[PDB]
Amino acid sequence: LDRTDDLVYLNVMELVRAVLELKNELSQLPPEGYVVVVKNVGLTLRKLIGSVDDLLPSLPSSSRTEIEGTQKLLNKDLAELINKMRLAQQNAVTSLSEEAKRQMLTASHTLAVDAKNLLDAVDQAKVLANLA
């Protein structure tokens, strides 16, 4: 597959990196620290859902929906990460601290997967656009 100017593939990798960062960094981060790397992970998502929203009109109406869904689904997953982040802050100093972090990771993770799912959902979408 030709990775010339497929904006979406790059943003994806970008995002996935951002998550991974967080994954490995959080172990060594202060409470104020989280907020930023999640912001990073938040931002890369904005670039993605951005480029995808432009590619959209040039797709089979069928897939056009299938994607807008995994789009709105992606948002629900970020929000869960944000929530699970706030928990980690007001519980930074408690015996609960160790779990919320896990949940934060799980959240960032499931966000990353659903991003890949968005990818494939667009690929197949492009395939059908060609068959036309």
Partner: peptide, 15 residues
């Protein structure tokens, strides 16, 4: 609507 909802989540995080 997606972009909107998402942007909103961002503003929240930044504040």
């Amino acid at each position: 609507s997606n972009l909107s909802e998402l942007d909103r989540l961002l503003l929240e995080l930044n504040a």
